[PDB]
Structures are given as structure tokens and as C-alpha cells.
Design a protein around this nucleic acid. Structure first.
Ligand SMILES: [Mg+2]
Lengths: 116, 64, 199, 144
RNA sequence: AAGAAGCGAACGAGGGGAAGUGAAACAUCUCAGUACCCUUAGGAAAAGACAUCAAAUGAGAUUCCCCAAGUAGCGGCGAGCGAACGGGGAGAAGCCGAUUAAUGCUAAUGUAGAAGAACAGCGUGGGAAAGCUGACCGUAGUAGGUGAUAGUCCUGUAUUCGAAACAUUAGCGUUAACAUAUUAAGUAGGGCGGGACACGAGAAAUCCUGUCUGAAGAUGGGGGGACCAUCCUCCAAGGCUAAAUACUCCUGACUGACCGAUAGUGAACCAGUACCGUGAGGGAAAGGCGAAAAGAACCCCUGUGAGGGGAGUGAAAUAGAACCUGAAACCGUGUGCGUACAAGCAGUAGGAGCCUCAAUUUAUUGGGGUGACUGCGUACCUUUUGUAUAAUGGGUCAGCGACUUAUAUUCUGUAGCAAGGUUAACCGUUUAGGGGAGCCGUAGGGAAACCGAGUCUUAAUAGGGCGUAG
């Protein structure tokens, strides 16, 4: 019962080369190089699923700091004032309000500043 | 037909008992003046093969 | 136990030979052993020893810049021997006598239980003629059938030879795979008695 | 009695074999369970029986003892519970042979108290132990 | 006058006879009486009828198979080597001419051959064997073909069958060549050195013989594993003998959970070729148009070239002869987007703009391509305490490339039977049925005799050791 490897080997290599579409040079063309580039891409993507949650909180905090300093407060006093006022609005939503609704963010700063 | 060969020299040293193997003890062949009579008494007779050694004994004497 | 022929005559068969509870694992082992006993097992490949040539070292060990080689018929090379080249094998199994008998018992009981066994008083074709057996099997409503009779007649055999999904067997040459493979089994009462005695 | 299409061996009947060196996911890739490069990882490697690495082995530390008796090779011990294989009431060495209780080249037989005897026998040319003898005549047989 | 010679598979018998290896070194030993060299047969060979075993109530030549048994033994008692008795089978046979070669009858075979059933319509289709409908043959229905898949189209198959000539096999008859012992002395036995016995000098029987010797001869001799006695057994020093057993250069039929062009023979092809080597010798690569050549008349460009474009053929011509399919590496052309102020495993997570398809009552979403800009981010394997490592390996792709097979053994699961389980070789009109020899379990203790739920040690009945569901 002799088994030829041609058809399965072909479809196996085509899966990897398909995942390597758009890569430079040998990285999208030749299997020995494509298979390393796909594995490294998956490794980076796994690490960056974690890191993106850090990067976006970084961004929200920056925008909230700018919004609060426009209203006369720093981030570390504004967040303390929210926690003292029992306001549960998350940083994602607070940054959205600071960016797209300046009067509402002014009202939130007023509440935090009255709490201090 | 090919069969496992017994270690014929191990068969001459080990014998089958109900739950193990029996053996004679060493240090009784010669040099026996200097040995105490307690050692001459207690080195005489059968010991049991140690539990750590009975795997090797089974590998060596597969038909006993 | 208590069965009827196609005509209506009552026949009493033993429960040990025709009523034993189905053991699918035992039936599987016996059927699979029967199948493995059909294998011829006649093949071979060549090892590096038995491929033509290959006696000299292809180049010297050091200094050529090449991976070291011992033979041009190594299994690594194109045209080399097979590492673990196959040789002829014996695929027959030892099936216990009682396991074979119990599997035949199980098979016969299961055939009765799913109504694939048909008892007839006799099945005698009077002329070595295929159409006669085709008519006799169409009235029995088993066009695709294994006809088990003691002392298979030397013109019923001829009448059955050319019918596609029909085989005629004597009770000594019945096998489990034959009993399982055909849509119906037409057993004479004499052959049912022989099966009672054998099993 | 099913189809050839639908017989199964049953759970636990079949186990798939291990194939060494078929990738990472199999748990047996690369070295195939042999570990790393020593004598045991090499091809024709064995576990040499009775070899302790050069230390004199146990069977050569210890003395040979005993001699082998030819008389014991032809003496067969017979249990009381094997006697249901005997045809008739007489129990002799020939009768034990034809019952296949003892090998056909056994010269002597000894009947020992292992099981129980269900009928009365007449033991002719065999040795019978004390408990075996009492059990035999409790079942109603005799020893001669 | 008759023969021989030489060549050529394997298997037989015989004369010589390694080493690598194993012993974790190595010399005894192993490998192994193997490889190889040499001699010489036959369809087989050899052996074979007791100067054999046994020690049982004895059996009754040789050979081969299954057990006995990895037992008894042998063994630097290491590594290893490894019986026999006997049991169960196959086959059987005993003779003194169981020879060889012809020829002649009678029979049979083989080497060419002969006949050999039964299907149409309709639709699709290049083509029908496939579809739908309805028939027929079958002692012939899973054969190979035929323009796609055919019991009924062809060759076949079932069945029945032929021989002028020659071969072969038997039976018979006859011839002509050779052979036809008459009971066994340089023999048995012995000393010395070797060899073979499973047995390595061993307490070493038995066999063989280079050397030196050397009987008795039936009122005798050989064997029974040193040896002696007794008992049993058998008569060497004459020859022969079928089968059961070994093999395959070949012939025929048949088969395959064997391969399918890097496989399978080295060799599917003008292969033991090309090629390499003084030579012995080594030793490739290389299959496929189409159903049918219908293999492209003729025209045009070109050098009467190559190559192409039309025309034509064809179902199909990116099926056009380097011809089925036609992957990848690799190399072009075209379109969209990006890219010439910016530093690194080239991705990833985000993200503007552009391009393109769709919706959507109309620049918003959704899909696709691209990716300015930001964060993070030193390949893979191996080997290591530890590798981005300036340590190893890989130019790339495709194809191939490494835990097998046989037997023994132990444990686990599962199935059947269960204090029992199971047969082996064989036979078998063969996976059945038969075959119980044997093996394992059912008892152990002890070196053993021996005893036995006990036994061993001991003066001890004490103590202690080991023992008290397959
Ligand atoms: Mg092509």
C-alpha cells in the first residue's frame, strides 16, 4: 500500500503560502521562509492582543488628561474626583466624551472639582 | 524457532520461590578463619533476591 | 426457537444454536479474522543489500565537501534500497474454536432476529437451468440469497452459478462473512439441523 | 448478523500504535522518546541483561548452588481436584497419563491434598500424602 | 571401436577454509565450518535396515515437520553455545539385479485448432456501453476491448470437442552393456597428536584418523557416557535400496489489502546500452497527441531557415507533434495603490488617504487591493548552563528520505471459555471439521533424596526462613 505524498504536501504548502500573502520577497513565495514568517506573525499577533489593551488605555488617559487640563484639573485629580463622586464611567467612554463632546466633559470636570 | 535464551549462569544462582527468588549469600567461599562465628552462621543459607534486583533477575531468567 | 417454513411447517431449532444473544465484539473479531485469512500476503521490496550494485563507497569520506556516503543504494538515495523493505507475511489469525462457534451462533440468531433467515423444506432444481432457480427464488421472495443446503446438488450448483447475488453452499463450507454478506439466507431444515449439531 | 458495514470491536478492544518521529503534536517527534544523545538513544541499543555498567553483576557476585536432579523430572504431583478428568475408578500412573493429568513420560506420581475428591477411587501405584489419604477414604476410596 | 572434454540457475555431496563482529578491551571463546576457493553429481542428492536405542508393559532402518526445550548440559561457567530420550505426525520396505541404455506394442498426455446464446426504441451527446422505456440468454453476469460505464457489438466465457507427425509419461515384451558379496584383519582395540560429537580435557564415554602399534574371531565380539561386576541388546571390518525432504535458469495455468515511471528489475524506452575504467569492474538517463493521423492542402511574413499568423481537421489545437493533465521554484507583460529626508529579522496591533465592486434614495456602510503615519518587535533548526549570536545546518522548489518485520517473552485492555483454558505439526472435497502430543493454571518447601498445607534447618516437637482465576 504505497502512499504518495504529492497531493497532501501540495495542499499543506498552499495553506502556509496563502497565509503569507503580501509578505516581501521569499516571505510570500518560498515555503521555508513563508512558514517562519507565518509563525512569527502569529506570535506577534498573540502578543499584540495583550498589548493593544494597554495601548488604548494609554490613549484614553492621554485624551482625558488633555480634556481635564482644558478645564483646570490634572488627570490624577480628575480621576480621584470621579472615584470620590462615585462616577463609574470608564476611560474609553470618558475619552470619547472629551474628544467629541466638550460641554459634557466640562460638566464631568465640574462634578470632580466639586468633589475635591 | 527463535526463543529467548536463559542466562544459564544466572539460573545457577537464582531459584524460583512462591513470591520471589532465593539465593545463597556471598563471602563464604574462603578466608574464613578471621570471620566471626556470628558471620559464619548468618552468611549461611538462603536470602531472598532484593526487590530492586528482581526485575533484572526476571529479564535474565525468563522461563523460571 | 419455534420457526415456520415458507409453506408453514413448524420447525423447532435449539436456542443455543439459533437464539444466543448477539455479541458484536465476538462477531467482529471472527469476521475480521476471516477477512485477514483471505490475504495472500505475497509481496516484497528490496533492502540496500538486495538492490543491484552499491558495493563501493561513492566518494572518499573527507575533503570533497559532500555529505558522506557509504553506498549508492542507501535508502536516502533515489534508487536506493527500502529501509524496512517489506517481505511476504502470513495474515491468518488463530480464532478459538469456541469463539468461531459462538460467532456463528450469534450470526444465525441475529439473522432470525432481523428476519433474514428463511427455512424451506427443500430446494431441488430438476434441471441445470438458471431460469428455474430464478423463478424458485422469486416465489420465495429472495432474489439475492445465500442458499444453504446439506449435500448441494450437482445441478442446483449449475443453476445458481450465473445468478449475480446468489450463492449456493453446503453447510460445511458456510462462513460467517457469507452468512452476513447476502441479503437473505435460504436454509433447508436439514441444514438447520446440521447447524444445531455443529454448534 | 449485522452488515459487514457495521461491526465494531467494542471499546477498549483496539489501541492505536505509537509512531515515533512524526512531528511535535504527536508527543513523539524528533528523538521519539529516546531522550538525547547517549548509548540508549542510538539505533542498535539495548538494555544488556545482567550488566550493571562494569560493576560485577549480581549473579556473578553470588555463588552457584545446588545440583539438578533427574529423578524430579519424572515425578508428577497430582491434585485431588484434577481427578475429575479420570475415566473410571482406578487411579494409576497409566490412568493419569490417559487423563493427561501427568505427562506421558512421567514415571512416578504423587497425590496431594489440594482440592476435594467427588467420588471413590482406587489409587494403585502412586504416593498419597496424609491429608490426601484421609480425604480419599472420607470420599470412600482406597489406596493400595 | 566406444566414450569424454565445454557451457549453464538454485538445491546435494565432498576437499580447503577467513575476518570484520560479540565478549561493552582482548588472547580461550564467538562470529562459523559461515563467506569464499576447489571437486563432482542427480532430478533430487545424502542417509538408510541395527555390532541402533531403551531400561517402559520395551521398541524396531533412513529422511522431514510439531513438541520435548532454551530444558539437560557445555562455557575466560564470561559473551555465548545448546542436545537427547521419548511423545504426535508425513512417509513407509526391505533386499542381494530395487542398474543402465535402446527398440517394439497398448494406453494416456502434450505440441496447431472448431463450434459456441441473447437488444431494441426514445432523449442527451463528437461519439452511448451511461439515462428513460420495454425485451431476451444464462451449465455463458463483476473478462479484455469497442469514440463515455455492454451478459445480449467484437474477441471471449460456460459447454462440447479435433491430430497426419513428433515428444513425454506408464504398462508389457525383448535386446545388449554392466553388476551379481557369502559374512569379512593391519580390522576392532591401544599409545601420541589433532578433529567431530550440544560437550572448550574434563571424571569423558562414543565417532574420525596423521603417527606408532595391534586382537579375539561365536566357548567370540561391540554398545549401554570414566571404570568393574551382573543384566539387556546387537553382530563391524561386502554391496544396494522408493517415499515423505531441498531448490527454480525454465514451461503452463492461476493469484495478489504487491509497484505504477525518482516507484517496480539496473533496465516499461534499441540497457547491462550510453558513459567511466588498462583491466577486473562500475553503471545511468530516457514512457503518454488524438477515438481515428483526420499529423494541418493552400495563402502570408521570413533566408525555399527557424518560428508564427490565417485557412482547414478535430468534441477539443494554451490536444500541433519537446503534443494528456500541466503544480512550484524561477522569469516577463499589464492594471491599481505605495515608494526618491529616511535607519535594522521586514511582521504585527492600530491607522489616514487613494483605487475598485456592491448595496443605499446616494460619498455612508459592507467586501476586496494598497498602506502614509504611530507602538512593539534581534529568523528557524540543532546543541547547550546559557545563542540575535560573529556556534551548527539549509541557495530555492518539486519529488523521495528515518522506530520496521519475524519469533520469543512480560504487563495492560478487550473477547470467548472458565478450575479449567488451548491444541501444534498434520489430515481435510482446506478459514470449517478432525488432530490432546504438548503448553499454561490448579502447591509448596528443600541442593537433593524426600515430604506436602506444609516444608527446610536443628539434637529440638524450640526458634527462625520460605509457603499457606486462570
Ligand atoms: Mg501539455
Amino acid at each position: 500500500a504505497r502512499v504518495k505524498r504529492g497531493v497532501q504536501a501540495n495542499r499543506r504548502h498552499k495553506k502556509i503560502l496563502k497565509r503569507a500573502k503580501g509578505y516581501y520577497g521569499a516571505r510570500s513565495r518560498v515555503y521555508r521562509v513563508a512558514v517562519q514568517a507565518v509563525t512569527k506573525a502569529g506570535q506577534y499577533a498573540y502578543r499584540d492582543r495583550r498589548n493593544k489593551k494597554r495601548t488604548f488605555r494609554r490613549l484614553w488617559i492621554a485624551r482625558i488628561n488633555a480634556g481635564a487640563r482644558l478645564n483646570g484639573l490634572s488627570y490624577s485629580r480628575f480621576i480621584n474626583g470621579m472615584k470620590k463622586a462615585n462616577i463609574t464611567i470608564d476611560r474609553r467612554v470618558l475619552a470619547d466624551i472629551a474628544m467629541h463632546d466638550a460641554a459634557t466633559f466640562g460638566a464631568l470636570v465640574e462634578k470632580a472639582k466639586a468633589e475635591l | 524457532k527463535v526463543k529467548m535464551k536463559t542466562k544459564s549462569g544466572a539460573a545457577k544462582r537464582f531459584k524460583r520461590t512462591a513470591n520471589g527468588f532465593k539465593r545463597k549469600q556471598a563471602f563464604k567461599s574462603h578466608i574464613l578463619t578471621k570471620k566471626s562465628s556470628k558471620r559464619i552462621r548468618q552468611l549461611r543459607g538462603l536470602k531472598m533476591v532484593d526487590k530492586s534486583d528482581e526485575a533484572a533477575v526476571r529479564r535474565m531468567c525468563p522461563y523460571i | 426457537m419455534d420457526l415456520k417454513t415458507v409453506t408453514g411447517a413448524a420447525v423447532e431449532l435449539s436456542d443455543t444454536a439459533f437464539g444466543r444473544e448477539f455479541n458484536e465484539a465476538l462477531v467482529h473479531q471472527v469476521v475480521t479474522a476471516y477477512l485477514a485469512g483471505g490475504r495472500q500476503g505475497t509481496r516484497a521490496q528490496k533492502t540496500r543489500a538486495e538492490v543491484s550494485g552499491g558495493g563501493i563507497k561513492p566518494w572518499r569520506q573527507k575533503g570533497t565537501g559532500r555529505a558522506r556516503a557509504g553506498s549508492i543504494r542507501s535508502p536516502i538515495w533515489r534508487g536506493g534500497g527500502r529501509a524496512f523493505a517489506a517481505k511476504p507475511q502470513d495474515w491468518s489469525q488463530k480464532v478459538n474454536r469456541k469463539m468461531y462457534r459462538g460467532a456463528m451462533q450469534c450470526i444465525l440468531a441475529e439473522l432470525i432476529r432481523q428476519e433474514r433467515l428463511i427455512l424451506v423444506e427443500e430446494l431441488t432444481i430438476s434441471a441445470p437451468k438458471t431460469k428455474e432457480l430464478i423463478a424458485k427464488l422469486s416465489e420465495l421472495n429472495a432474489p439475492r440469497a445465500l442458499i444453504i443446503t446439506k449435500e448441494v446438488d450437482e445441478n442446483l450448483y449449475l443453476a445458481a452459478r450465473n445468478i449475480p447475488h446468489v450463492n449456493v453452499l453446503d453447510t460445511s463450507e458456510v462462513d460467517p462473512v457469507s452468512l452476513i454478506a447476502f441479503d437473505k439466507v435460504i436454509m433447508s431444515v436439514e441444514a438447520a439441523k446440521q447447524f444445531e449439531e455443529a454448534l | 448478523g449485522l452488515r459487514l458495514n457495521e461491526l465494531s470491536p467494542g471499546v477498549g478492544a483496539k489501541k492505536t500504535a505509537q509512531r515515533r518521529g512524526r512531528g511535535i503534536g504527536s508527543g513523539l517527534g524528533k528523538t521519539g522518546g529516546r531522550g538525547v544523545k547517549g548509548q540508549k538513544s542510538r539505533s542498535g541499543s539495548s538494555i544488556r541483561a545482567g550488566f550493571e555498567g562494569g560493576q560485577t553483576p549480581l549473579y556473578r557476585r553470588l555463588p552457584k548452588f545446588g545440583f539438578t536432579s533427574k529423578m524430579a523430572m519424572t515425578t508428577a504431583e497430582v491434585r485431588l481436584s484434577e481427578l475429575n478428568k479420570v475415566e473410571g475408578d482406578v487411579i494409576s500412573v497409566a490412568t493419569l497419563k490417559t487423563a493427561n493429568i501427568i505427562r506421558h513420560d512421567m514415571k512416578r506420581a504423587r497425590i496431594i491434598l489440594s482440592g476435594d475428591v467427588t467420588k471413590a477411587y482406587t489409587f494403585q501405584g502412586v504416593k498419597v500424602t496424609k491429608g490426601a489419604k484421609q480425604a480419599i477414604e472420607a470420599a470412600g476410596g482406597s489406596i493400595e
